[PDB]
């Protein structure tokens with residue numbers, strides 16, 4: 001099966017691509033415009049495969065995307081390209097509106113023409129799988145708002161949308177566009193919403209990687225506000241496996257939430273990392289001593305937690321890692337990958 | 353209070369402007385780019401008021417919109433400008449995406465900067481009122497599916513978003529942007545979702561106007577499916593009153609559903625108009641004789657119905673009209689405004 005993937009040089013995207021090439025019979029054409037977020041080095045031990053093809057393009061460029069579809073005759077699409085940085089363009093567009101909304105619209109129109117011009121067989125098997133975030137659901141009650149032993153609510157596929165940031169609002173919109181094209185034109189679409197990913201090849205400035213690296217450089221490990229914030233951490237390699245499962249076995253018109261089956265406070269994440277770093281790599285003092293509390297960010301969602309029961313029940317997917325086993329692997333990865341980290345920090349990675 | 357309004361030359365927009373000038377102490381600056389949908393003639397008996405100002409501009413034009421805010425220093429904003437025709441683009445984003453989504457984003461950014469630079473007093477009183485549709489809610493169970501006297505569901509402010517067309521998807525997105533700006537930047541925003549509007553100044557090709565005009569012209573009154581579709585009809589003048597009520601008394605961060613407190617099948621609408629045209633402008637033969645059956649559009653939402661209890665309970669608003677009294681006023685209006693109708697049909701209205 002040939003899978004056309006957008007955002008393939010990204011954090012999650014690269015995990016998806018590496019998975020398909022290393023563990024499946026499928027082939028992939030990766031469409032990525034390589035913004036500051038893309039990294040071809042994250043695909044380095046896969047880019048020589050004859051089952052992999054790279055196309056340097058912007059999903060907003062219809063002409064180019066149309067060409068690529070016509071040339072590769074994809075059996076399915078996995079849409080991961082997105083802008084997570086909220087900017088403020090002078091002239092016009094803010095990249096996140098352009099890429100996340102207009103880009104999804106643009107891609108949907110190319111895929112619609114392509115799909116409708118297919119033959120009965122290939123047309124009934126085609127799938128447009130849209131990758132999204134749990135942030136579209138808004139916020140959940142926090143443990144300290146609900147008093148003693150009351151079972152807290154979880155995000156399910158029928159939880160109402162309630163975006164609270166420009167980024168999540170832009171993703172919620174792309175979600176709506178994907179579902180409307182299905183109901184209006186009959187396009188084969190599927191939508192998945194996942195929680196926070198962590199793991200190998202995550203950029204240096206991200207939360208978990210930042211704690212691990214600052215720890216090592218003898219710098220401040222920040223805990224924001226009370227370290228209050230609750231998030232459901234999903235290991236990237238697990239997300240990657242769920243996504244391929246969904247695109248190949250997912251049912252058109254369905255939605256699937258994906259999560260790591262856990263819930264953790266930021267403070268717990270920082271401490272867990274320090275404990276691992278004390279076990280592996282011991283030193284003259286505990287890494288804990290660099291922990292420092294810092295600024296809180298205004299009206300931020302207090303708790304995200306996903307109920308992944310549906311995907312388990314219907315497709316049989318469950319994470320293979322636990323936060324414990326996953327975090328350990330992550331720390332080990334950063335310790336063994338200084339080169340990759342340094343190329344990102346120096347900018348060297350943007351030279352292909 | 354100076355109210356800045358977008359889409360003021362449109363169907364609903366013109367009703368809002370006329371209402372503020374005829375029945376309030378407030379002043380208004382109307383920003384409209386005058387697409388095929390705008391009609392300055394609909395504002396003719398109000399355009400000379402010194403309390404009214406017109407600005408010919410596109411909401412996507414940030415420089416222009418910024419100048420306008422700075423010049424009129426608005427106490428509030430009523431955003432009604434939107435593109436309801438779903439077109440396609442041989443060059444990037446279609447109009448509805450540009451106007452409904454990007455345009456709302458653009459407007460939000462100008463209003464944010466303006467608002468944050470106000471002055472404690474005027475800054476706490478400022479309001480950004482976003483006008484939207486009940487279509488964002490998806491579809492409701494139809495009478496013929498929910499057997500016997502069960503009782504059917506209604507759209508409430510907490511009903512889950514589930515857009516099923518490109519248009520409704522674009523409006524649902526503008527809604528998400530509006531709320532995120534509030535939660536993220538603290539912008540005073542409000543959102544209202546209303547049902548199908550009908551009444552004076554509704555373009556000739558619209559459903560109700562078309563039935564009235566075709567009927568008198570003696571032409572056929574075609575019905576699509578079994579005339580199954582159910583909709584909540586809200587008289588435009590009623591909507592106009594609710595909107596002003598909301599912008600002046602509405603609470604920041606709140607959502608209000610607005611409807612005509614009714615539910616009607618299309619077949620009932622056609623029959624109701626024929627009955628009235630038989631009463632007024634009586635004809636030996638009955639106007640139903642003209643009713644005929646054609647085919648109908650695929651997978652369309654079967655039932656929209658709004659629960660307008662919250663706005664009643666909290667702001668004390670209720671429709672003054674009933675579907676019956678309102679349809680009567682509408683028929684009388686068309687019979688009395690051949691000139692307006694003909695100027696729209698000929699294109700002459702687009703000469704200012």
Ligand SMILES: NC(=O)c1ccc[n+]([C@@H]2O[C@H](COP(=O)([O-])OP(=O)(O)OC[C@H]3O[C@@H](n4cnc5c(N)ncnc54)[C@H](O)[C@@H]3O)[C@@H](O)[C@H]2O)c1
Nearest residue numbers: 007009010011012033034035037038059081082132133197
């Ligand atoms: N990181 C997370 O925890 C997370 C959690 C939930 C959902 N998601 C979703 O997963 C998807 C991928 O997330 P990620 O963290 O790996 O993103 P990322 O920032 O790591 O990568 C985005 C990729 O898309 C590319 N890109 C950006 N704009 C583009 C455009 N206009 N045309 C083509 N390519 C473009 C970038 O060059 C990059 O390779 C997104 O859609 C995101 O919303 C991410």
Ligand SMILES: NC(=O)c1ccc[n+]([C@@H]2O[C@H](COP(=O)([O-])OP(=O)(O)OC[C@H]3O[C@@H](n4cnc5c(N)ncnc54)[C@H](O)[C@@H]3O)[C@@H](O)[C@H]2O)c1
Nearest residue numbers: 359361362363364385386387389390410411434484485549
């Ligand atoms: N007609 C209905 O039944 C209905 C029902 C529910 C919600 N709504 C909402 O009410 C609002 C107004 O509806 P309507 O039927 O009166 O619309 P309309 O089509 O009659 O008028 C739209 C107006 O906006 C202007 N406009 C379009 N694009 C613009 C742009 N980029 N910049 C500035 N002005 C622009 C047009 O010139 C026109 O005067 C919309 O936001 C719509 O979603 C309408």
